[PDB]
Amino acid sequence: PVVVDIHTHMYPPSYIAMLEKRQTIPLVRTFPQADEPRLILLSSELAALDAALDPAAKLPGRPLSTHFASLAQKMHFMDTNGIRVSVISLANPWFDFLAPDEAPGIADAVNAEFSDMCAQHVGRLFFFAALPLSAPVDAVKASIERVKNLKYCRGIILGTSGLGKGLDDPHLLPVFEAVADAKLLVFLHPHYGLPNEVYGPRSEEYGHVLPLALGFPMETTIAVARMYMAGVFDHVRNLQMLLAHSGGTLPFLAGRIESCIVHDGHLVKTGKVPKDRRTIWTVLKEQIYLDAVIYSEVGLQAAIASSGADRLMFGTAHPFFPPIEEDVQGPWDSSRLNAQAVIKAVGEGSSDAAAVMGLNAVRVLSLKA
């Protein structure tokens, strides 16, 4: 049985060294009272960083294990968790924070690193590239041309900020067109979350649960809905999009979105809701793929009902949710839960199981050579 993981990240050592030299988010710090460094990515982690410098105050961020930067460690995880092929991607926030002039050069270097990592285990590793979206659109297009010509590259991973004004930014259209024409799957992934005040004044007490469990998928939903409302999928008809975490909440809210559209007085009266309009259901079946990183047959079944079994792809979200604090060199419960969600949704040994667990990814992303 062929298992493929399309949701699995790394930070190359050069990228981590960069983060260690940074003053502002994202950054890496190393505290004396802990072994491995602290990865600090979110604005929700800022106060804990401030607080951690008594040493009895909790360590900020999350630990930067060897599973972030070691390729042997990625392969070990794959071998121990029964994964044949990984389509690896740079973790959030990618190159979003880089200065415009430096961004393309660093992106092309780091993208080439990922290609080289894939060459170490040919057949078992492909990758999503990231883009220098702080740079001019000219440079973004140039970087897109490069990753198209890098071996083992099968798509682009990107966040919700776009050029800095979201994914409904009309300046971003030529970027979507270039990627779509290059036959590169766009993997949309969260990072920026929601403004932290929505979590209220006790959010610190709940650890990372609210920003990660709610903020991330809600961010993804908002970004895709904006793309949809802006007509991006109509503009770029051959654009294909993989959505992280089974679309965030999109499968569950697709109906409410459709109802709110057709019952929007202003939009209907101003010709924004025409008779031949492609519904979000249609887009979900034609231009959107969903990963199966949803941790439940309940969510997964909604995702399957929305996009179809042939458009769902298994993922683990490695290395972000290691087991606490047991054998990290053993199987990961966070990976197992998603495999269990699939099995319970469609039945183990079913062709839908085989499709979701790897064959969809093999087919859609041409995972050969």
Under 8 Å between Cβ of 242 and 290: yes
When asked if residue 157 is in the footprint of Zn ion (CB under 5 A), the reply is no
When asked if residue 317 is in the footprint of Zn ion (CB under 5 A), the reply is yes
Q: Rule CB under 8 A: choose which of 81, 143, 220, 306 binds a second copy.
A: 306
* Range list of H helices, the chain: 13-20, 46-51, 71-80, 103-120, 137-148, 173-181, 209-210, 216-229, 232-235, 250-262, 265-269, 280-286, 297-307, 333-346, 351-354, 360-364
Q: Which amino acid, 107?
A: A
CA distance 321 to 63: 10
Of the two residues 132 and 217, which places its CB atom closer to Zn ion in the complex?
A: 217
Tokens of 110: 């780091």
Q: Which residue is nearest to ligand 5CU (CB)?
A: 317
Of the two residues 75 and 212, which places its CB atom closer to a second copy in the complex?
A: 212
Of the two residues 104 and 251, which places its CB atom closer to ligand 5CU in the complex?
A: 251
Binding mask 330-369 for a second copy (x = CB under 8 A): ---xx--x---x----------------------------
Stretch that binds a second copy, among 3-11, 13-21, 296-304, 346-354 (CB under 8 A): 296-304
Q: Which residue is nearest to Zn ion (CB)?
A: 317
Greatest alpha-carbon pair distance for the chain in Å reads 64
* Range list of H helices, 272-322: 280-286, 297-307
CA distance 322 to 332: 6
When asked if residue 56 is in the footprint of a second copy (CB under 8 A), the reply is no
Binding site for ligand 5CU (CB under 6 A): 9, 41, 91-92, 212, 317, 320
Report in angstroms how near the CB of residue 261 gets to ligand 5CU at its nearest: 14
Report in angstroms how near the CB of residue 366 gets to a second copy at its nearest: 30
Q: Rule CB under 8 A: choose which of 22, 151, 183, 263 binds a second copy.
A: 263
Q: Which of residues 279-308 bind Zn ion (CB under 5 A)?
A: none
Under 8 Å between Cβ of 144 and 182: yes
Of the two residues 112 and 214, which places its CB atom closer to ligand 5CU in the complex?
A: 214
Q: Which of 332, 261, 336 is nearest to 295 (CA)?
A: 336
Binding mask 66-105 for a second copy (x = CB under 8 A): ----------------------------------------
Under 8 Å between Cβ of 70 and 12: no
Q: Residue 156 pairs with which residues in a beta bridge?
A: 129, 186
Q: Rule CB under 8 A: choose which of 174, 308, 323, 331 binds a second copy.
A: 323
The crossing angle, in degrees rounded to 10, of helices 297-307 and 333-346 is 60
Of the two residues 220 and 236, which places its CB atom closer to ligand 5CU in the complex?
A: 220
Q: Which of residues 131-190 bind a second copy (CB under 8 A)?
A: 165-166, 168
Interface residues with Zn ion (CB under 5 A) are 317
